[PDB]
Scaffold this active site. Structure first.
Site, PDB file in Angstrom:
ATOM      1  N   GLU A  17       0.818  -1.206   0.000  1.00  0.00           N
ATOM      2  CA  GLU A  17       0.000   0.000   0.000  1.00  0.00           C
ATOM      3  C   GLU A  17       0.853   1.258   0.000  1.00  0.00           C
ATOM      4  O   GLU A  17       0.447   2.270  -0.572  1.00  0.00           O
ATOM      5  CB  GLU A  17      -0.946   0.000   1.201  1.00  0.00           C
ATOM      6  N   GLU A  26       1.780   1.691  -3.610  1.00  0.00           N
ATOM      7  CA  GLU A  26       0.614   2.130  -4.373  1.00  0.00           C
ATOM      8  C   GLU A  26       0.291   3.595  -4.096  1.00  0.00           C
ATOM      9  O   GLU A  26       0.003   4.365  -5.021  1.00  0.00           O
ATOM     10  CB  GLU A  26      -0.589   1.249  -4.043  1.00  0.00           C
ATOM     11  N   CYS A  46      -8.050  -2.077   4.853  1.00  0.00           N
ATOM     12  CA  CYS A  46      -7.744  -3.109   5.834  1.00  0.00           C
ATOM     13  C   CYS A  46      -8.917  -3.421   6.754  1.00  0.00           C
ATOM     14  O   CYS A  46      -8.944  -4.501   7.352  1.00  0.00           O
ATOM     15  CB  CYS A  46      -6.529  -2.690   6.665  1.00  0.00           C
ATOM     16  N   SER A  76      -7.958   1.464  -1.386  1.00  0.00           N
ATOM     17  CA  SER A  76      -6.725   0.759  -1.704  1.00  0.00           C
ATOM     18  C   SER A  76      -7.043  -0.582  -2.352  1.00  0.00           C
ATOM     19  O   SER A  76      -7.896  -1.333  -1.871  1.00  0.00           O
ATOM     20  CB  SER A  76      -5.899   0.551  -0.437  1.00  0.00           C
ATOM     21  N   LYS A 108     -14.534  -9.774   9.758  1.00  0.00           N
ATOM     22  CA  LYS A 108     -13.598 -10.654   9.066  1.00  0.00           C
ATOM     23  C   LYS A 108     -14.261 -11.968   8.675  1.00  0.00           C
ATOM     24  O   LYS A 108     -13.867 -12.584   7.681  1.00  0.00           O
ATOM     25  CB  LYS A 108     -12.376 -10.913   9.942  1.00  0.00           C
ATOM     26  N   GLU A 148     -15.729 -10.996   5.494  1.00  0.00           N
ATOM     27  CA  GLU A 148     -14.695 -10.823   4.479  1.00  0.00           C
ATOM     28  C   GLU A 148     -14.202 -12.167   3.957  1.00  0.00           C
ATOM     29  O   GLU A 148     -13.984 -12.330   2.751  1.00  0.00           O
ATOM     30  CB  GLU A 148     -13.534 -10.012   5.050  1.00  0.00           C
ATOM     31  N   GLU A 155     -14.822 -12.476  -3.815  1.00  0.00           N
ATOM     32  CA  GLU A 155     -13.457 -12.271  -4.285  1.00  0.00           C
ATOM     33  C   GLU A 155     -12.435 -13.030  -3.450  1.00  0.00           C
ATOM     34  O   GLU A 155     -11.300 -13.212  -3.900  1.00  0.00           O
ATOM     35  CB  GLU A 155     -13.116 -10.780  -4.282  1.00  0.00           C
ATOM     36  N   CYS A 198      -8.721  -2.194  16.239  1.00  0.00           N
ATOM     37  CA  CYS A 198      -9.124  -3.584  16.397  1.00  0.00           C
ATOM     38  C   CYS A 198      -9.051  -4.075  17.836  1.00  0.00           C
ATOM     39  O   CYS A 198      -9.594  -5.143  18.132  1.00  0.00           O
ATOM     40  CB  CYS A 198      -8.264  -4.478  15.502  1.00  0.00           C
TER      41      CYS A 198
HETATM   42  S1  SF4 Z   1     -12.112  -5.055  14.621  1.00  0.00           S
HETATM   43 FE1  SF4 Z   1     -13.303  -3.218  13.987  1.00  0.00          FE
HETATM   44  S2  SF4 Z   1     -11.716  -1.762  13.239  1.00  0.00           S
HETATM   45 FE2  SF4 Z   1     -10.711  -3.808  13.325  1.00  0.00          FE
HETATM   46  S3  SF4 Z   1     -10.988  -4.655  11.225  1.00  0.00           S
HETATM   47 FE3  SF4 Z   1     -12.747  -5.417  12.459  1.00  0.00          FE
HETATM   48  S4  SF4 Z   1     -14.388  -3.880  12.094  1.00  0.00           S
HETATM   49 FE4  SF4 Z   1     -12.444  -2.909  11.407  1.00  0.00          FE
END
Ligand code: SF4
Ligand code: FMN
Ligand code: SF4
Ligand code: SF4
Ligand code: SF4
Ligand code: SF4
Ligand code: SF4
Ligand code: SF4
Ligand code: SF4
Ligand code: SF4
Ligand code: SF4
Ligand code: SF4
Ligand code: FES
Ligand code: FES
Ligand code: FES
Ligand code: ZN
Lengths: 642, 311, 553
Positions: A274, A277, A294, A314, A353, A356, A361, A486
């Site tokens: 990144e 980039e 991220c 990004s 996550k 995700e 993708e 996080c």
């Molecule tokens: S814990 Fe919260 S800030 Fe960290 S990646 Fe997950 S949603 Fe985003």
């Protein structure tokens, strides 16, 4: 101020908002079910009743005054408090064994303390909602209607996807029209879960999949998030502990993990990519300002809310996806084992996550994502004292990471890592950091050559809207959906308020401090990865880059009269608007329904109701096979159906 | 009560509850005194061995399973009864030469050699000498001596369900695995035989079978899932057919019957699309009754029903 | 003994019954649901599985040897353990909010720890048995069939009224023919409740009646048993307070109690009367051996088992009933108020006291009985920091007591106080205490003028049968149904094992150590009561004496 509580002199405080808080500051506790999290308000539980001047009233709404005689315990108050608690428990889904708040639930503790052993009231039935379509699971039968999640989603996260609906006994916190949470604009940050005082909001547990995978013949590979090691110690009620990650590695290897890696390596790789980039974008002055990708919650929020900024995101995927793709596509070849044989387990502090890892993708890269709480459950099942576990280092070649990579666990981590990468590549003359607000930090950075830019770090979704509307003088913007980054993720141990988040950030900073190499390039393994596997740009693009698509609700939600679940049909829709209703449409609908009642033995014809089709002034309308007729009637729709 | 410890407990006038075996019954059995427990056939063999010589007694049998074994053969066969065969005799010999084949209209599908604690055998294992050591490395065993032949007209899922029902009834209820898991596995099989199963149910059954086998206190629970494991390994296809359709052998559907559940039937179409006999003639919008006069019991209705209500 | 656990060095003791306990002693823990109380045995849960020589086995039935390697945690063991726990939870009655073990249940903690958020095992229907006829409440839907209650009732208490019935899935712990407990020979000692790890055995909760009475216009009067003050500190997880009784008095006053009295006053009264009658029996020699009747569980056991000894039972009612009768028949009169205007609340450590208060002999004297756990629940409702409450004395004229009176809380209290009263009236030469075994103590007591006699103290029902059959030379026998006396009563805080009961006895001894009055005769209020209201023999009998009748089905 001097007050009399149950007949004894008590000094509360000089200036106070209400009696309950003043007494709590003193150390006198009045039972209540309102103060349940940082997003709590007063007035709904009604359990804080005190007696003053004869009349009973709530102490949370009572302004204290000099020399006030207050009785906090009288037989009438006992009766009323037990009645209120029994009322709450009568309609509560009392299954604590399978509840996610078991052992940390205020309602459960009160039921224990209040000696409630049988329900005097009727467990009346409600139209409860059970949403399990997303990593955030909703079960309104355990909801006490405190409203903390609504305030968290609206005021703190800025999404407002969950709200109070209906009224009275049928009051329920839910999405609009009971839409599945996966199908709404929910970003799955998990903050509502982090603030929920009951099991109504919980995280989807996927321990069974991990256990069946470990039991199989596949090679299980684990990778731990930087912020997981900074908060896992809370689940066991022990003090902060650097080297938490290495004893976690030892435990995971003990329970059958073949390899355990560090997601901080993926963070370093992502920061390097990144930084390059962003430098290209700067030299071209295009696709600016740039947004970090991220945080999957922020990415989904942008897809829902800023379709025009999707080109500014990004291209680099998040550390989890980057490291998982590297594993599946390079480490598998280096080990001479098919990609199907490797089972990839991610230990994250985030519920987004999970979403995700299931994105189109990213299909098939990360097999399962387990939150910090699920990892703590794994440890607690074994009953081994993790504090006594001897640490061992992560596995090569993705085990080491720079201090900057481990900094990803808290807000400002990726921006600092990018700054370090740029500084090493091209020095930085100076950095000036300002703090316009609490969760917003802006840095002015000057490079050695002379070209300068501005970067902003924003943690806590909902602050993004104002900043984007009023500030247009930045080139790179870090967005973290959760407060403090996080360390305050949705999947972190409960409770998850600001004090614990700050302590987690301090723990992660202490862990960072004991790392020798300071920048990603000093990571020899990462440079070896670039030199051997990611040498060319095509492979690098297919490995570390992804594309984003806009999100828009696709609601048809037409009125159903005689639906057909599936199979080829005619899907005839009759307009039910006022203009169409003014002449015929309802009669036509009745005639068609009776027709399919006498004819249409099978599901060939599907009779639907639809709202105004913006064709008023052209007689009643009847949509057939998604076609406009105009001047429709029973014979005119029969002829088309032929 | 066939368990050694349970047998000793029941002889003492108590509940036949088995117990862990650090003190094996040989060292301490009845009221703590050394006890010798053996089957009837072994005691009968003893005098025969003493009357004969060791070599004379070993002249018939196998180098590791000398002597003979008495079997009770049941199931549809021309001649069924007690038989005595030298060790090493194959199941084909017993089923065709000593029992004279099957009655007309009956073919061979499987055979049970040890009841619930036994195993299910197919046409691949029929030609195998009956030896104590040989069957252990075959997912089988000579068993107590009970042999029942299974014809092509019986459903193996039903066989496993029957054995699990028996074991569930006979469990002493001491240890959690046998007591609870046998009931749970029987419930899963009961769902299977009623066309309510799913692949998830099959996975649950397999894992639960492994858990019951490994964690049960005594032999009854340890061998409780033996019919499940054998029948799965040998008729996984029949299990699948029960999952995604009807009973291939017709046993389940022979005396069962299909009924539309009006509680969850909103009167959509389908049904008639596949039904060759058109036994629906329902009222649109309301539950579609199934005319049982002309229901061949093909089972296509359940195979495709978005709101699963073909009960 | 060098063994390897999960590929490391572990040093265990040389002689251990099983690997599970060896690992426990050294420090390694293995999840299980067999070790649940003092009356627990191994082999049922099957959750202690370990990998030995490539084969999975239970560690509770495995003898440790030298150099053995065990994998304590493996994915196969993980799956087996969660399968077993989910099998337990599928049929369990999962309503923890209205359960008495809520917050102190091992099964609840494991469900929390194992992450069991759903059950793929369908909830099969069991013919569950719920009972509410007796103060001891039964609910087989919460039972994990550990068998601890059966062993407690048979081996310890010697009654054996609950046993395993049926078999298989329908296995249940019940009474003969599902008979309600109140109709069986159960003595309502509540020890099965004290040992039950689940909510299957609970104590009937009567807080609603107390709150209704406190809301009424009645004069609510409370009395606290001596042993309640020595254990209530455990429910709050804080150190023992030698002045806890006074803090309880203050708290009860805060919640609307007109008067709070000490049951130790009733203990002094009962000991005085019982010593007098026992000495009279010694003089004449009729109805010996004399049995104490201060334990209702023992009284019911004698009625069921020893109908020949009912005349031998002491006619003096227990301290609870004696003090309650005195209150409602004398104090109400001296207050110029009708008896029905008074609501007498008893705070006891015993579940058999609930049954005693409801007996036909004493009906309408004690309006309600609450256990130590129920008083602790009352204190927790108000959220008042009991440790910071300012103590105050008990209300007059039944607020003081002697060391001997307060000694009733532990086994050997009534006997000791009777000896105190005798020595006060007729001196005592010497006492030769003997300890035939753990729960029995025989003492030779010689008086200044006359011959000697032997008195026996038996705590723990079950020892009574063997002692009475074997021994025929003791003149007075003191029987406590629960081990260690009332400090180990069934209404005491959970868990209550031998160590907890010994700690409670030590706390009670320390509380007794601070009392100035040593004998019931020194109690001035007690003597005033005798010389003002109980002057005549007829009133003394009609206020302090009761009768017993045989029990049969
Ligand atoms: S814990 Fe919260 S800030 Fe960290 S990646 Fe997950 S949603 Fe985003
Ligand atoms: C559920 C169960 C039932 C059993 N039933 C019998 C039986 O009916 N007769 C018998 O001889 N052995 C029976 N056994 C075997 C005994 O447990 C044990 O193996 C016996 O002592 C072996 O005797 P043997 O050496 O003479 O064969 C049974 C075992 C189990 C686990
Ligand atoms: S929220 Fe969960 S733990 Fe709390 S009372 Fe409800 S079911 Fe029990
Ligand atoms: S996960 Fe976040 S966005 Fe979704 S409902 Fe909860 S607070 Fe709102
Ligand atoms: S879902 Fe949770 S946070 Fe939201 S109102 Fe209900 S109990 Fe409160
Ligand atoms: S396996 Fe079955 S029969 Fe054997 S002890 Fe356990 S419950 Fe009883
Ligand atoms: S397909 Fe199913 S829902 Fe439709 S009519 Fe037939 S039984 Fe009813
Ligand atoms: S089972 Fe077959 S024959 Fe019977 S009603 Fe259904 S489709 Fe028709
Ligand atoms: S015994 Fe009570 S607290 Fe424990 S799991 Fe069962 S219902 Fe919950
Ligand atoms: S209260 Fe005592 S006598 Fe009654 S069942 Fe329980 S242990 Fe047995
Ligand atoms: S009632 Fe309680 S002590 Fe008795 S078997 Fe059931 S769980 Fe165990
Ligand atoms: S010894 Fe005490 S606690 Fe136990 S039953 Fe007798 S009176 Fe109650
Ligand atoms: S604290 Fe809830 S209404 Fe007062
Ligand atoms: S009302 Fe029908 S088109 Fe508008
Ligand atoms: S500890 Fe319960 S069976 Fe081993
Ligand atoms: Zn079948």
């Amino acid at each position: 101020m001097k007050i009399y509580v149950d007949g004894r002199e008590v000094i509360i405080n000089d200036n106070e908002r209400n009696l309950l808080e003043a007494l709590k500051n003193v150390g006198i506790e009045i039972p209540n079910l309102c103060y349940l999290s940082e997003a709590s308000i007063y007035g709904a539980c009604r359990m804080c009743l005190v007696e003053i001047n004869g009349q009973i009233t709530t102490s949370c709404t009572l302004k204290p005054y000099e020399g006030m005689k207050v009785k906090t315990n009288t037989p009438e108050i006992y009766e009323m408090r037990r009645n209120i608690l029994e009322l709450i428990l009568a309609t509560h889904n009392r299954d604590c064994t399978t509840c996610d708040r078991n052992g940390s639930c205020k309602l459960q503790k009160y039921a224990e303390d209040f000696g409630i052993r049988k329900i005097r009231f009727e467990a009346l039935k409600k139209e409860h909602v059970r949403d399990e379509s997303a990593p955030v699971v909703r079960d309104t039968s355990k909801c006490i209607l405190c409203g903390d999640c609504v305030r968290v989603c609206e005021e703190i996260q800025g999404v407002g996807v969950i709200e109070f609906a209906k009224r009275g006994f049928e009051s329920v916190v839910t999405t609009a029209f009971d839409t599945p949470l996966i199908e709404t604009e929910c970003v799955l940050c998990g903050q509502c879960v982090a603030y929920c005082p009951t099991g109504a909001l919980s995280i989807r547990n996927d321990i069974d999949k991990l256990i069946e995978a470990l039991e199989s013949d596949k090679i299980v590979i684990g990778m731990i998030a930087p912020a997981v090691r900074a908060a896992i110690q809370e689940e066991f009620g022990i003090d902060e502990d650097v080297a938490m990650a290495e004893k976690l590695v030892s435990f995971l290897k003990t329970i059958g993990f073949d390899k355990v890696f560090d997601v901080s390596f993926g963070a370093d790789l992502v920061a390097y990519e990144e930084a390059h980039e962003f430098y290209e974008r700067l030299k071209k002055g295009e696709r600016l300002p740039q947004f970090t990708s991220c945080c999957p919650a922020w990415v989904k929020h942008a897809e829902h809310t800023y379709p025009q900024y999707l080109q500014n995101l990004s291209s680099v995927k998040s550390p989890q996806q980057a490291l998982g793709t590297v594993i599946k596509k390079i480490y598998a070849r280096k080990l001479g084992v098919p990609e199907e044989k490797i089972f990839l387990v991610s230990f994250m502090p985030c519920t987004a996550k999970k979403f995700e890892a299931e994105r189109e993708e990213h299909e098939g890269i990360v097999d399962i994502v387990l939150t910090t709480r699920e990892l703590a459950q794994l440890i607690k099942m074994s009953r081994i004292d993790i504090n006594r576990v001897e640490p061992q280092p992560f596995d090569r070649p993705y085990g080491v990471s720079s201090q900057a990579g481990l900094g990803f666990g808290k807000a400002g981590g990726v921006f600092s890592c990018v700054l370090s990468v740029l500084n090493e590549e091209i020095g930085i003359e100076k950095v000036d950091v300002k703090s316009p607000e609490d969760g917003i930090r802006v840095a002015e950075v000057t490079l050695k050559d002379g070209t300068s830019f501005k970067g902003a770090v924003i943690y806590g979704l909902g602050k993004v809207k104002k900043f984007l509307e009023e500030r247009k003088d930045v080139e790179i913007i870090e967005v973290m959906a959760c407060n403090y980054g996080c360390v305050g993720g949705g999947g972190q141990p409960y409770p998850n308020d600001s004090r614990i988040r700050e302590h987690r950030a301090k723990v992660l900073r202490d862990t960072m401090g004991i790392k020798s190499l300071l920048t990603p390039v000093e990571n020899l393994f990462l440079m070896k990865l670039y030199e051997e596997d990611l040498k060319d740009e095509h492979t690098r693009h297919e490995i570390l880059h992804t594309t984003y698509r806009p999100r828009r609700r696709y609601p048809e939600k037409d009125v159903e009269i005689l639906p057909v679940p599936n199979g080829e049909k005619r899907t005839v829709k009759v307009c039910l608007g006022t203009s169409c209703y003014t002449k015929g449409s309802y009669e036509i609908l009745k005639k068609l329904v009776d027709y399919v009642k006498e004819n249409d033995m099978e599901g060939k014809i599907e009779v639907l109701g639809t709202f105004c089709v913006e064709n008023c002034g052209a007689s009643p309308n009847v949509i057939v096979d998604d076609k406009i007729i105009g001047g429709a009637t029973f014979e005119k729709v029969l002829e088309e159906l032929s | 009560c066939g368990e050694e410890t349970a047998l000793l407990a029941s002889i003492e006038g108590k509940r036949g509850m088995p117990r862990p075996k650090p003190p094996f019954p040989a060292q301490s059995g009845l009221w703590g005194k050394p006890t010798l427990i053996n089957n009837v056939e072994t005691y009968a063999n003893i005098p025969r061995i003493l009357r004969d010589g060791v070599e004379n007694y070993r002249k018939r049998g196998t180098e590791n399973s000398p002597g003979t074994k008495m079997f009770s053969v049941a199931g549809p066969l021309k001649a069924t009864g007690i038989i005595e065969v030298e060790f090493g005799t194959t199941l084909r010999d017993i089923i065709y030469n000593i029992c004279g084949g099957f009655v007309e209209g009956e073919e061979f599908k499987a055979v049970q050699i040890g009841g619930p604690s036994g195993a299910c055998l197919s046409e691949d294992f029929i030609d195998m000498p009956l030896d104590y050591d040989t069957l252990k490395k075959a997912d089988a065993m000579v068993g107590s001596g009970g042999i029942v032949v299974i014809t092509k007209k019986t459903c193996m899922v039903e066989v496993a369900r029957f054995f699990l029902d028996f074991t569930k009834r006979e469990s002493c209820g001491k240890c959690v695995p046998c007591r609870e898991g046998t009931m749970q596995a029987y419930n899963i099989l009961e769902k299977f035989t009623h066309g309510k199963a799913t692949y998830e149910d099959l996975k649950t059954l397999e894992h639960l079978s492994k858990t019951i086998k490994t964690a049960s206190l005594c032999g009854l629970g340890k061998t409780a899932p033996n019919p499940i494991l054998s029948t799965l390994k040998l008729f996984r296809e029949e299990y699948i057919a029960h999952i995604e359709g009807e009973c291939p052998s017709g046993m389940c559907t022979a005396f069962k019957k299909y009924v539309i559940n009006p509680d969850i039937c909103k009167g959509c179409g389908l049904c008639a699309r596949s039904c060759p006999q058109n036994a629906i003639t329902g009222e649109r919008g309301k539950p579609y009754t199934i005319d049982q006069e002309k229901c061949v019991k093909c089972g296509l209705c359940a195979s495709k029903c978005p709101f699963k209500a073909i009960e």
